[PDB]
Design a protein around this ligand. Structure first.
Ligand SMILES: [K+]
Ligand SMILES: [K+]
Ligand SMILES: [K+]
Ligand SMILES: [K+]
Ligand SMILES: [K+]
Ligand SMILES: [K+]
Ligand SMILES: [K+]
Ligand SMILES: [K+]
Ligand SMILES: [K+]
Ligand SMILES: [K+]
Ligand SMILES: [K+]
Ligand SMILES: [K+]
Ligand SMILES: [K+]
Ligand SMILES: [K+]
Ligand SMILES: [K+]
Ligand SMILES: [K+]
Ligand SMILES: [K+]
Ligand SMILES: [K+]
Ligand SMILES: [K+]
Ligand SMILES: [K+]
Ligand SMILES: [K+]
Ligand SMILES: [K+]
Ligand SMILES: [K+]
Ligand SMILES: [K+]
Ligand SMILES: [K+]
Ligand SMILES: [K+]
Ligand SMILES: [K+]
Ligand SMILES: [K+]
Ligand SMILES: [K+]
Ligand SMILES: [K+]
Ligand SMILES: [K+]
Ligand SMILES: [K+]
Ligand SMILES: [Mg+2]
Ligand SMILES: [Mg+2]
Ligand SMILES: [Mg+2]
Ligand SMILES: [Mg+2]
Ligand SMILES: [Mg+2]
Ligand SMILES: [Mg+2]
Ligand SMILES: [Mg+2]
Ligand SMILES: [Mg+2]
Ligand SMILES: [Mg+2]
Ligand SMILES: [Mg+2]
Ligand SMILES: [Mg+2]
Ligand SMILES: [Mg+2]
Ligand SMILES: [Mg+2]
Ligand SMILES: [Mg+2]
Ligand SMILES: [Mg+2]
Ligand SMILES: [Mg+2]
Ligand SMILES: [Mg+2]
Ligand SMILES: [Mg+2]
Ligand SMILES: [Mg+2]
Ligand SMILES: [Mg+2]
Ligand SMILES: [Mg+2]
Ligand SMILES: [Mg+2]
Ligand SMILES: [Mg+2]
Ligand SMILES: [Mg+2]
Ligand SMILES: [Mg+2]
Ligand SMILES: [Mg+2]
Ligand SMILES: [Mg+2]
Ligand SMILES: [Mg+2]
Ligand SMILES: [Mg+2]
Ligand SMILES: [Mg+2]
Ligand SMILES: [Mg+2]
Ligand SMILES: [Mg+2]
Ligand SMILES: [Mg+2]
Ligand SMILES: [Mg+2]
Ligand SMILES: [Mg+2]
Ligand SMILES: [Mg+2]
Ligand SMILES: [Mg+2]
Ligand SMILES: [Mg+2]
Ligand SMILES: [Mg+2]
Length: 101
RNA sequence: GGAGCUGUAAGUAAGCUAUGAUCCAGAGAUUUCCGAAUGGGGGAACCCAAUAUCUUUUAUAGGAUAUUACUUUUCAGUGAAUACAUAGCUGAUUAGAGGUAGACGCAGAGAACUGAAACAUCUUAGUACCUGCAGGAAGAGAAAGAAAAUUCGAUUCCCUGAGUAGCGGCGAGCGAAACGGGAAGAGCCCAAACCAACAAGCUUGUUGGGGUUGUAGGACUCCGAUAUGGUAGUCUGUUAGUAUAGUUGAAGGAUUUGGAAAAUUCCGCUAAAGAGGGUGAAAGCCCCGUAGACGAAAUGCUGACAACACCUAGGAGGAUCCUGAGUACGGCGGAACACGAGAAAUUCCGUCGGAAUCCGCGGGGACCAUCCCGCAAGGCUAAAUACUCCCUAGUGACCGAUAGUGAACCAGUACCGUGAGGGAAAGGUGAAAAGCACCCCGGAAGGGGAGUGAAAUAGAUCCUGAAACCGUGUGCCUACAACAAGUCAAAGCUCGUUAAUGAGUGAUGGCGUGCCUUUUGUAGAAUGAACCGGCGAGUUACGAUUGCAUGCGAGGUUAAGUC
RNA sequence: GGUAGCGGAGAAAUUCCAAACGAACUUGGAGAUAGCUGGUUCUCUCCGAAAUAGCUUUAGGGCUAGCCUCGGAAUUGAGAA
RNA sequence: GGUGUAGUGGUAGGAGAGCGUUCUAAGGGCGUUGAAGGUCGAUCGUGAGGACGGCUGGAGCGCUUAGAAGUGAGAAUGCCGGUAUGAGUAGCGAAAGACAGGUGAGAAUCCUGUCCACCGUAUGACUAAGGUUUCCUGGGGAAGGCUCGUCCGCCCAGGGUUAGUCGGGACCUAAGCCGAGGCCGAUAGGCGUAGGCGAUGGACAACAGGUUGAUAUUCCUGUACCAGUUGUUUUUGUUUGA
RNA sequence: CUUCUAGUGAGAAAACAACUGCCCGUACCGUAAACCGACACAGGUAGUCGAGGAGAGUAUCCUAAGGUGAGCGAGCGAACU
RNA sequence: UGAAAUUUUAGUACCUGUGAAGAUGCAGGUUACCCGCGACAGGACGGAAAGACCCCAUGGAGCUUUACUGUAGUUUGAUAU
C-alpha cells in the first residue's frame, strides 16, 4: 500500500473526516489501516480476557486505505504520493511539495 | 519487492523480519508407500527374500545402501538329442510395457431401435459401441491423372457445379465428380541396368560409386564442365525479439442531505489516461488501475546471421543393356466407388489361373479399332485442414442460486447399491462484529431490560420476507335451518375513502348443479387437480414457397476468400 | 472356490441367477418409435366450419374434393328469392 | 371529424389490432429528501392492464422510439419445495413389577436396597465371521431413544488392545486361480507346461495363579519348553576321515 | 519328519553359564440394541461348554451357576375384534 | 408421544321424478334447533392398481411348424496345399 506503519495520515472520508493521527497497524491483504484515535468502537467484552470486569472497551477499528492521505511532514498537509529514486534509493515523494517520505 | 509475516482460521503460545522476512518469477535439491510396478508374493498403498558392502551385539537376532521382472535389439560366453552345429542356459547391451483429452486422425471388427406409414432388398449406417496404432495434427500427396475449349499439370481444404448427372423393392430414400472461383503452395529419394572393392562358390552375396524417367529416361560411347544454385538438415554458435515476476504512470476542495458522499451546489483541474474494479450511496481528479513509458539474473520459444552438414550439372549417338512378377490381368466369392450386378468401367480383399516388357504397357465407364493422355505393381514430403484436457488475455441484446456445470458452499461429496453404477440438498447479518458488557426470570433453552449500530421486526433459522398454513384481538352476522356457497334486491348495525349517486357486514327474498379434459351429449355417479409458491410445451439451423416491404430493374445478385 | 445372460443352473415349476427372470442388472445407441392418451401459459376485434363424397392392409389414421378464412384479378353480372 | 344505414352469440379454425415481461441501442429522466420488491386503498382504461397515495424496504429503476426473445400457466395421476386434511386419530413392536432411600431444577422410567417375577441344551459361559471404538473413566441432556430421562450402545473430553509358545506370516499342500517359454486366435485376447499362489485340511515349543477402570497361555509371580549365538569345562577327529 | 548313501568335511558332541528370538491380530458386541434384515425390528446367524429332581433323554415342569424384568404408562373392566 | 392412504371448494337430509337413462348438490314435496362422543358399514358408482376379461394398434415379447427368407453346424464334389 502507499501508506505505511508509523505514517502520519489525514482521514478524508468517514465520520472521522479531517482528523489526523499516526498509523498503528497496517493490513495490506485487507487494504486496511488503523489510525490512533480514529474510528473508535465500544466493544462488549466478557471478563475472559485477563480483565476481571470484561467491561465495554474502546479500541480503534481498521479503515479502508483509500480513506486516508499521508500528511506532508514538511508542510503538515495531506498530499498524494509519487515515487522518485533519490541517491539510488526508491522513496515516497509529496506531489504537493516534493519532500521525501 | 520493500514491511510486515507464521494459509483457510479465530485463539491463545512461541517466534521470524531493513543482516530485507512473508510474498512473486526462473533454475535446482529432497520427493515415504501403492500404482505399468518390474526381486517374489499379494485381498493396492502390505508381507517375505537372494546377492554385495556397510552398521548394532561378545555373538545370533536387528538396521542402511546398491542390484536382482518379462519380452525385443546387439554382443559375448557357455552349451542338448548329435558329429559338426543349432536349440537351450548365463552375462552384458538396446527399447518397450502404462496413463491420457469423454476432443481431433487412420485402421480392424461392427449393431439394433428407426424410415419404408407392415417387411426381407434398402434405410438408420459404416453410425453407436469394442479394439489397435498414432501426431500435434493425422490422412493424402508429385499423374500408368483431369480432359477432349485444347489443353491443364502433386496433394489437401473452401465456394460452385447441385439436390444436377446418376443410383434405388425406379419405392422410402441415397447422391457425385470434372470444369470455374479461392486458401496454401514444394518437391524429392531408391530398385534395375553399369563400374569398383570385399568375401566365397566364371556367378554370387555385402559395401561404395551411378540413376531416378513419358515432349520416354538411364546405362553405355563421345565430347566440357569441375561451376552454378538450393535445403523440407544441427540442443553448432552469435544476435534480435518474445514468454514466464515487475517499475513508473495526470488531475478537487468546499457546500446541502446523510451514520457514511462518490450523490446535490459552487467554483476548479487532468486527459496518449472518461476501459474497468473498490472505497461507509452513483468518483475522470480517494485507492487499484487504464493511455503511455520502462524493465529480466535465470530457463524456455521464435526469427535472423554465421558455422557445419547435405543436395545441385550441359550437349550428342543409339548397337546393346535396364526401367519395380506370382505383379498386371482373368475366372470364382465378396467389398469400396453417389453407382444395390446392372451394359459396367475404376479401386480393394480371399481363392485359383496367370502377361508383356519400348515395335512395350495402362486409361479415356462393357468391348473393339483409331486418336489422345499417361508410365503401375517402391518410398518420403511442409502449408493451407480437424480438435481443446489444459495455460494466458479478453468478449457476450449468455445464466443469476428450482437458473448457470451434477457441483458458486470442502461435489462426484453425503446418501443409495454386492458391483458396475446412480447421485443430492445447501449462496446473502452489518459500512465496520461494533456479534448484545452488566442486570432480571429460568437448571438451561429462550426472553425482558441495558447497550452497539443509521437501522436489532438487521441478533447470527440473521438483506428483502410473498402465498399456502397457524394464532391472537374484534366492527357486523349466526343455534327452525336443506346452502356449486355466489349473484340480484334489501332492513338493520358499524365506519368515514384515490370524495365517489362511499366502505364493511348482513336478517330476509329471487335466480342459480364448480374448473378442465374428452364427447352426439358431462353438474356429472366419466377424466385431472389436496393447497400455495417456483419451474414446465411450436424453437433454431439450412432449404422450398406465398404475402408484405426496400433497392435496382431486362436485369438482379454475389459465394468462398483478402483487408 | 467353479458355471454369466445369444448365457448359466435346473429330481423340470418358465424354476433360480442379489427382495418383480417367457429371457438379470448397469451404461450407451437414446430425446428409440408411439397413425395412441394426457398437457400446450396474455387480451380484444372481424369471420366462422365439419362430423360428407371418393380412394386407402382402410375404417378412432391419411390424401384430393366438399364446407371456413385472408389476399388478389376480371366480367355482356355470371349468385339468391 | 360529422350524419345516415346496416351490423357486432360462437367450438375447430383463419385474419387484424393490442397489453404485459426480460434484455440491447439512442434520447430524455428518476433515486439514502428513499429505486426495485412487498403490502393496503373506496383509482383509470373497452380488454389484456396503467397510475397515484399510505406503510414496509434499503439501491438501483422507469419513460419514448426501435430491436431480440429461455416473453405470459390452472390443470400434463407434471417436477421440486413448503404447508395442510385425516387428527390430537392409528400406532408407541411378544413378558412383572412393587415399595423405601438417594440424586436432581425436575424421577413410574437414573442409582442403592429389599421382596417378587422371568430364562436356565438358555434369555447362561466361550468363541468364528461380521461390525469397527460401539470397550473404560469423567462430564452433558441440543438432536437420536417410538413416553420420560438426572440415563444410554447417543454427544463432549481424556484413556484403553503388551506374545519365541495362542490364530496368521517368515512351514506344506486340495479345489480353484495366476502363469516364463509355449499352443490357438480379426484385434482384444483364450488355453496351458515348468513354477507359484491358495484353507476351510496337514505340521508346529507353556501352563496355573495373580493383577487393572479398561489387556492378558500377551503383563506379573512360579515353574517350563522350542530354535539359536558367545563363552567355560569334559569328552574325541582331524583326510584308514569323527 | 526318520533313514540311506551321493556329496561335504576339521572340527563335533555333552554339561554348565550367560544371552538372542521379527511382522500382523489381540479392546468391545457376538441365539444380538453393537452382525444380515432401512429401525434399539417377534426373522436369519457356524462351532464349543451347556448342571439338579423326576426322566431313555439336550423331551417336559420347576430350579443351580449365571443372567433378566423387555424404553410409554395410570385408570375403567361397555360393544366389537 | 404422534403418522398414513385420501382430499376441486363445500353451510355435505329423505321420497318421487329429471338428467350421460342409478342425484347430498337439479325439480316438487317432506323432514330437520346448534356442536360433539361411542358404535355400524347402505351410499359417496367409496380408497388402493391409466382393467389382466373384451376389442383396437398395419405395438412388443416368448414359443411352434411341411409360413417366407436366411444362417451356425453336418455332409458331398471341384480345386490349392
Ligand atoms: K502390482
Ligand atoms: K477432449
Ligand atoms: K432392420
Ligand atoms: K411405420
Ligand atoms: K503426413
Ligand atoms: K445439391
Ligand atoms: K416402398
Ligand atoms: K546421384
Ligand atoms: K474512498
Ligand atoms: K471509479
Ligand atoms: K531468453
Ligand atoms: K463395378
Ligand atoms: K492419362
Ligand atoms: K433489516
Ligand atoms: K377473524
Ligand atoms: K341469496
Ligand atoms: K372410472
Ligand atoms: K430348483
Ligand atoms: K399441478
Ligand atoms: K401430514
Ligand atoms: K390434522
Ligand atoms: K452420565
Ligand atoms: K487351521
Ligand atoms: K485380548
Ligand atoms: K435321574
Ligand atoms: K435338564
Ligand atoms: K421404560
Ligand atoms: K372403560
Ligand atoms: K365380543
Ligand atoms: K355421465
Ligand atoms: K358405509
Ligand atoms: K414377456
Ligand atoms: Mg514389487
Ligand atoms: Mg417400418
Ligand atoms: Mg508427440
Ligand atoms: Mg495514478
Ligand atoms: Mg464532483
Ligand atoms: Mg456400394
Ligand atoms: Mg482375383
Ligand atoms: Mg483395367
Ligand atoms: Mg469411351
Ligand atoms: Mg504424352
Ligand atoms: Mg500437413
Ligand atoms: Mg433467491
Ligand atoms: Mg444448482
Ligand atoms: Mg422490518
Ligand atoms: Mg429476514
Ligand atoms: Mg318448523
Ligand atoms: Mg333463528
Ligand atoms: Mg360416450
Ligand atoms: Mg383426483
Ligand atoms: Mg407351463
Ligand atoms: Mg428374485
Ligand atoms: Mg438413433
Ligand atoms: Mg428488474
Ligand atoms: Mg416460458
Ligand atoms: Mg401447482
Ligand atoms: Mg376418526
Ligand atoms: Mg415395548
Ligand atoms: Mg427345553
Ligand atoms: Mg459404556
Ligand atoms: Mg458415561
Ligand atoms: Mg425423548
Ligand atoms: Mg494357465
Ligand atoms: Mg474385558
Ligand atoms: Mg477379549
Ligand atoms: Mg329418464
Ligand atoms: Mg334418480
Ligand atoms: Mg344448490
Ligand atoms: Mg373405486
Ligand atoms: Mg386403460
Amino acid at each position: 500500500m502507499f501508506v505505511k506503519k508509523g505514517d502520519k495520515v489525514k482521514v478524508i472520508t468517514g465520520k472521522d473526516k479531517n482528523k489526523e493521527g499516526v498509523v498503528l497497524a497496517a493490513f495490506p491483504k485487507q487494504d486496511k489501516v488503523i489510525v490512533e484515535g480514529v474510528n473508535v468502537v465500544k466493544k462488549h467484552q466478557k471478563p475472559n480476557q485477563a480483565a476481571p470486569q470484561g467491561g465495554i472497551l474502546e479500541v480503534e477499528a481498521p479503515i479502508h486505505v483509500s480513506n486516508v492521505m499521508v500528511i506532508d511532514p514538511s508542510n503538515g498537509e495531506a498530499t498524494k504520493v509519487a515515487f522518485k529514486e533519490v541517491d539510488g534509493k526508491k522513496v515516497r515523494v509529496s506531489k504537493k511539495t516534493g519532500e521525501v517520505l
